[PDB]
Symmetry: D2
Subunit: 378 residues, 4 copies
């Protein structure tokens, strides 16, 4: 059901990613190197501005085209960490700003994230507030026209390279859910303390440090939405995050399937291609079923959000399905290749290491299941 | 993405099935009773004529509407055996006749199946030719204007009540695939021998006897397609069968999900509803994920066939997914209800017994996997 | 690790079951007929007396030999309902009586259950006390030397044919878990009301009616253990039940594996035996792995109980594993046979229907998981 | 069923591993450092000599004690790569030498491997002969009292540090299976070329380079067994390898279970410990079931090999079960910990990376399934 414009644009995205995004991935993964050159090239192409209206220097593309192009990006670009870093910037930072920001807030910050080279971070999670986000301890005390922010935020994607921080704090912890408020703090604000990026299994080309706020002053002008709107901002941010952060992962799944079919047809054992044995062929049949199901979950959310509908249930189902489908297909691709798929220089192992992250960011598999159960009535 | 006409027609199908299809299903399943009254009422409604053009007395509905209305029928009608019996008549008999039949063959036989109360059977499988259907032994020898048919066909859905038989035979077994030819034989033709309907686990309200042909004479005018076209006719009829026979099963899955949510909310243990325990709620979360995936496989095939595309791969993926998804969801519905779900009077047990059949008719799960692997290039 | 005596005795059990237990199983399952003739022959052989001391007319066999012989019984006897009915009588009735009964209680009832043709029932479960068994509503009011019992017990295996009833009641519901008490009530005691046996999916050759107590008088002499000991009696009964009710199911699993290997080697398709296709062969590989794991869980509990140890965790792990392993292997046996495995006259379908019951009696799969989690410290 | 001396010896093994095997595992894994100091300490303790008779400087333990002590080593030692490197040396090199070697071959080489600090490698696999091991191309041409070896062996565990090489070659490729012969070649023999150790996902503390033989001369005295015995030697080598290489992995599984229980009880969310949520507690119930099953498969093989029985089927079942059980339990341990389990410094991520290797060494999961199917008669 994709038109000529959509086929050609995705084909243009794949070609761009295959030609002008080449990196020494074995080295960048091992050494934990974020590709700033590739981020800059993607922004020049328009990746960041894809769901953003043209009045804020965006590309003003429809959601279905944005999701289709992202899938193309995932297929063409092997750097999964870069893809994750950009999606965090787009869906968890640019989107809530576009929806809840005032005309002056949007006119100042959106063109910068869009075209300017400014990077954004979403800092909401805390050591005792991961799954239980509502139980945030980061307080924001009003002092006339300003706010004094104090707290600790662990896991802040892009933190060490971010120019603007989207922070979820509370005006009063007694209020609970009703006390949650969002603040936009620029990089190098006195009181904003960052750690060195934390070492992890995969997504090593994406910088994830810790953040600490020690009497961090912010004007009431940089507060996103009214006092107490923080919950509505977070729930809206998760809708875009859960449903779209894994759009490119579907593309990666398509690349691994074609690579595995090629190997199952090429590699021979017992006088025949490995794919001639049903135990090998079935792994590719399972990879195919998962890929088509992932596309279905992605395109339903994309359609719903384009038709201005509330799709938290659909985004949760998409994130739960695609994250697990991705890990499983990666595991099977390594199996098809045998011992060869376990070697560093093959690069299939990195794919699995990166895939696991998706089971933790945007919420755990168990959280999505709890969210789905609530929507069923339970 | 369904229009007002589609929502209203499916709602009309559910209401019709809930009001005018009421049967003593515990009794009819136990005693193996085929509901002729309900078959007649469905034909009066237009079920049989749904994919048939209005010129042959059909409804001339588009495939996507036909599939949506079928999902509605499955939700509203509890008689899974009747649903299977009708889908076998529509997709494996009416469809190949509409596609490969001459104007005179269609004008004679199609209006009868639509509105005449004529029932059709598809007899292709044999004791030594189930999965290996190309290895058919049923021979057809030409004698001027006629053909003398000899063979044995096991598993003939609707056989004991059919008025017209769609038979897959061979002109010369040496030719193999190129020798396969189809014949339309009317009920009670000298040489057409039927057994008593065979007793099975589920689908007990659908008559499945054995067939024997002892020098069965048939005119060359009643031969569907040219000599050797039988393979093309079978492959076409599988495409429609695999993709659409389980359209109603998706509806049944929707009914059991809502029935299980109601029970998980109603039934209490340890001072709370069972659905408050995550091990119970997760079974409903799995039922929800499977239901949405089943809809996706069904609607892709429906779209493709409507847009006149060859969808054997998509029909095989749909039949493989939906048949297993149904059995699994049926098993979980019994689990949610506990020992209560194991009792005859609850009716959830019959649902599982009926669901298993889907793993054997239209081809086994293993056959679909082999078919998918071939389409992948293995 | 089995000696000559153990090999020969099991071989003697198989031969006995294969020669003198022959029944019209298709008919008895369809018509719901309990085989009293086979129950009598098993008692004459000594089955019921296997874990019982010779002084109470038992066989005085060690647990490991008892479990090995019961596996042999499961392999040789096709009537799964009879096997379930006998195991309920042995483990849930004879065992708590042997452990908690006084000399006079043992001397009177045990020889009768062993060789007297007396059948016993275990009535503990209630409509609002299934999984939450401690929340029993059946009250027992003391009136000098007697007790007045009032309540309702659903699912009472052997109820319609039992001579002695093992009833779990409460002296005071305010005490809860500390108020539980066990009573032995003889058949046809004024106030003991039984329903017709309830119709179910499988285990149709085992009678499971409902029980109602309306001012049922019982002597303090027929009270098993002291007041408040009911919990200890139930927990002890569950150890023997969970760990040994499925000992014969392991034997049934061995029979279906060899039956399926024979079919996979005999039945041919595409010019070779079906077992030559890896998707068919893998089902038997899975059946083999499950059979060996089931033996391991069964023999661990048998050893522990033989060495007078508390094995509730091990019995729960055995019942959870074996019940699910049995259902899964039954489904695969039907799959290997194709449409043939779905027919009533084949008998593989009945196996699956019987196997499901194991997921509900002796506690549900979810309950076992909860029990295991508590033992782990969670 | 373990006695006081077996409990005490395993406890002594755990204490030794916990106190005198401490390494900078995050660094060694990242930098690919083999711990020679820990290998030396293990040999001083007697690890290598455990299944070796005291005559050849061994410890002469019974297999059941050896397996129990290896389980203890896996629990106490976190360096999975060292454990794999040692098990490769014991089971694939020392064991075939003990069984097939002459008195002079055993007297010279066994005391060295056992107590001399000599390391051994098993080189059988080739680029065109992995699963299809019979199709070896490495030729051995006789020249009176010597043999000229030519070929290429990929994946040679311990190759870069080995003093003795166990090589599988062919006297005549036309003979196939009947032409297979084993040779013992000492390190630095002209013609023995080794590559740099290959970089892989996990097991990074174990050196796995490639090997090339260019007119490598070896005496007929250093030929293990007679000409054509190579298959019997390999299949005997696979019995010990498959059944005992994963004995320590069972210990690792026990460590991760206790570590995960501690975290599920300690870590709190939504006002309670995470283990109070059934989706978390079930991962630990599954970890428990898998651990007990792994112990059962390990102890069956250990018993059979102690009682001098052919256990290739049992070793294949053990390898297939344990390797998959290990990967799954590692994945779940990371899930229980959330994002915390994905960090390098947590060390759970390395456990999973190491676990995957087990699905490729000693044969792939698919190969074991094929081996099991052959034993069943398919
Ligand atoms: C309720 C019901 C109604 C039916 N109605 C009709 C009807 O009206 N008309 C009609 O023509 N047919 C009908 N059939 C037949 C049906 O399509 C068969 O179940 C199907 O053709 C499979 O044949 P089989 O069961 O004989 O199994 P087999 O084909 O004998 O195969 C045996 C087993 O081996 C496996 N196997 C076989 N070949 C391969 C392979 N190449 N690769 C891997 N595994 C393989 C399969 O998984 C199967 O389990 C009906 C069947 C049922 C159950
Ligand atoms: C064939 C048969 C014979 C029987 N014979 C006897 C007999 O002789 N004597 C006797 O006393 N009983 C007998 N029973 C009763 C049997 O033990 C029950 O099936 C069992 O007690 C649980 O059944 P239930 O559905 O009433 O549980 P329910 O309490 O109805 O549970 C409903 C569902 O919720 C889930 N659930 C409930 N509580 C929890 C929890 N805490 N955590 C997680 N999930 C939970 C369960 O998974 C279950 O599926 C028999 C049952 C059967 C099927
Ligand atoms: C860490 C490590 C250390 C090793 N150390 C040694 C060592 O010291 N000495 C040594 O000799 N070897 C060693 N090996 C080699 C190891 O045993 C191989 O992984 C194994 O032999 C499988 O070969 P392969 O990976 O080449 O895959 P292949 O054999 O090429 O097969 C490719 C794929 O096809 C499938 N397949 C192949 N044949 C069949 C079939 N008949 N039926 C079904 N599916 C099939 C398999 O599942 C596999 O995934 C080591 C391997 C590893 C990973
Ligand atoms: C690569 C990466 C990048 C990230 N980037 C960001 C970022 O930029 N900004 C940001 O704000 N956050 C970020 N996060 C945090 C991320 O969203 C967390 O992984 C998520 O919040 C869960 O964190 P947790 O493991 O602390 O959860 P925990 O709350 O510690 O959960 C512990 C375990 O218990 C289970 N559990 C907990 N509660 C329940 C329940 N109610 N029901 C059932 N099971 C339950 C969960 O399954 C989990 O496995 C990032 C995480 C990762 C891994």
């Amino acid at each position: 059901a994709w038109n000529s414009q959509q086929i050609q644009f995705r084909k243009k995205v794949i070609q761009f990613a295959q030609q002008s995004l080449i990196s020494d991935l074995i080295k960048n993964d091992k050494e934990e190197i974020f590709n700033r050159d590739a981020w800059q090239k993607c922004s020049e192409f328009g990746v960041h501005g894809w769901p953003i209206p043209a009045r804020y220097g965006g590309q003003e593309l429809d959601i279905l085209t944005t999701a289709y192009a992202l899938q193309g990006l995932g297929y063409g670009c092997k750097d999964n960490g870069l893809i994750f870093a950009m999606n965090a910037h787009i869906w968890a930072c640019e989107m809530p700003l576009l929806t809840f920001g005032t005309e002056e807030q949007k006119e100042k910050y959106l063109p910068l994230l869009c075209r300017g080279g400014w990077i954004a971070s979403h800092a909401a999670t805390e050591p005792q507030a991961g799954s239980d986000i509502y139980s945030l301890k980061t307080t924001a005390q009003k002092d006339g026209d300003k706010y004094i922010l104090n707290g600790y935020k662990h896991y802040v994607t892009n933190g060490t390279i971010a120019d603007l921080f989207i922070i979820f704090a509370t005006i009063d912890p007694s209020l609970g859910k009703e006390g949650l408020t969002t603040f936009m703090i620029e990089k190098d604000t006195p009181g904003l303390i960052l750690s060195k990026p934390i070492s992890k299994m995969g997504m090593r080309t994406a910088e994830v440090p810790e953040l600490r706020l020690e009497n961090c002053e912010v004007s009431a002008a940089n507060r996103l939405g009214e006092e107490g709107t923080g919950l509505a901002i977070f729930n809206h941010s998760m809708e875009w995050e859960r449903g779209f952060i894994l759009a490119a992962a579907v593309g990666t799944m398509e690349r691994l399937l074609e690579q595995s079919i090629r190997y199952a047809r090429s590699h021979k054992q017992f006088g025949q291609a490995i794919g001639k044995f049903q135990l090998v062929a079935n792994k590719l049949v399972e990879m195919k079923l998962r890929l088509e199901n992932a596309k279905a979950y992605l395109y339903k959310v994309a359609w719903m959000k384009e038709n201005k509908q509330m799709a938290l249930l659909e985004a949760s189902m998409a994130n739960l399905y695609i994250s697990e489908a991705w890990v499983q297909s990666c595991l099977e691709a390594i199996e098809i290749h045998g011992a060869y798929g376990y070697l560093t220089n093959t690069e299939l192992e990195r794919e699995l290491r990166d895939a696991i992250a998706s089971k933790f960011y945007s919420g755990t598999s168990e959280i999505q299941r709890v969210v789905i159960a609530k929507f069923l009535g339970l």
